[PDB]
């Protein structure tokens, strides 16, 4: 089968970005999203879904990449939530670091971006360890900004997460052509 590695950014001592409300942590959002994407993709027998973390545990960047490399993942998707010094910043972004990951970023963004319904900030280059050191198509998704009051609430909305999780799942399913 085709192996899909889903990486929920941060975890444990690393809370990631703290929402403007000061009541939500990015790590919480990342895990909830990863678990939802896993549940959706698990229904596909042509896929073998592996999560770098399935609970609130700490994982070094090198460790997340090692799993993907060791299990020979076909794709790698790191899920994150963004933060800005200005509470006005908002939108969804998809990052790639290597040329071989651009096709996947394009397909992923095609289904992922519309699902968030947030401002489409497009596909951008990002020098992030997990998408740089990986050798298979790898993208990092910054779903939305936790620094924006309305957007933070939206990212922690159950329906939003389910819709976006399906979009992320579609990006993977479509790219791997396992419909």
**Which residues line the annotated binding site for Zn(2+)?**
10, 26, 80
Q: Classify the C-alpha dihedral 99-3-39-30 as positive or negative.
A: negative
Using CB under 5 A as the binding rule, whether residue 16 contacts Zn ion is answered as yes
Residue nearest to Zn ion (CB): 80
Whole-number minimum distance, CB 158 to Zn ion, in Å?
21
As measured in angstroms, the least distance from the Cβ of 57 to Zn ion is: 16
Shortest distance in whole angstroms from residue 140 CB to Zn ion: 8
**DSSP H helical ranges for the chain:** 26-42, 61-70, 102-116, 129-132, 149-155, 158-176
Count residues near Zn ion (CB under 5 A): 3
Q: Which stretch binds Zn ion (CB under 5 A): 14-22, 123-131, 145-153, 156-164?
A: 14-22
Q: Which is nearer to Zn ion, 4 or 8 (CB)?
A: 8
Are the C-beta atoms of residues 16 and 148 closer than 8 Å to each other?
no
CB distance 171 to 111 below 8 Å: yes
CA distance 24 to 18: 6
Select the span of 1-9, 31-39, 45-53, 87-95 touching Zn ion (CB under 5 A). 1-9
Does 9 contact Zn ion by CB under 5 A?
A: yes
Instruction: Output 3 or 18, the one with its CB closest to Zn ion.
Output: 18
Separation between Cα atoms, residue 87 and residue 94, nearest integer Å: 20
C-alpha distances (whole Å) from 157 to each of 3, 27, 99, 128, 173 are: 29, 15, 34, 27, 24
For 95, the enclosing helix (H) or strand (E) is: strand 92-96
Q: Which is nearer to Zn ion, 80 or 121 (CB)?
A: 80
60-89: contacts with Zn ion (CB under 5 A):
80
Binding site for Zn ion (CB under 5 A): 9, 16, 80
């Amino acid at each position: 089968m085709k192996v899909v590695v889903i990486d929920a950014g941060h975890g444990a001592k690393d809370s990631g970005a703290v929402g403007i409300s000061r009541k939500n942590y990015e790590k919480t959002f990342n895990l909830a999203m990863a678990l939802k994407v896993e549940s959706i993709l698990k229904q596909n027998p042509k896929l073998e879904v592996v999560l770098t973390r399935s609970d609130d545990t700490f994982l070094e960047l090198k460790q997340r990449v090692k799993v993907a490399e060791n299990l020979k993942a076909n794709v790698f998707v790191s899920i994150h939530a963004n933060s800005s010094g200005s509470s006005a910043s908002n939108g969804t972004e998809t990052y790639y670091q290597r040329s071989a990951s651009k096709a996947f970023a394009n397909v992923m963004h095609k289904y992922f971006a519309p699902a968030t319904g947030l401002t489409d900030r497009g596909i951008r280059y990002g020098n992030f360890h997990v998408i740089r050191e990986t050798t298979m198509p790898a993208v990092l998704l910054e779903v939305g900004y936790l620094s924006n009051a309305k957007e933070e609430a939206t990212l922690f909305d159950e329906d939003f997460q389910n819709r976006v999780a399906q979009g992320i799942a579609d990006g993977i399913t479509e790219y791997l052509d396992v419909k």
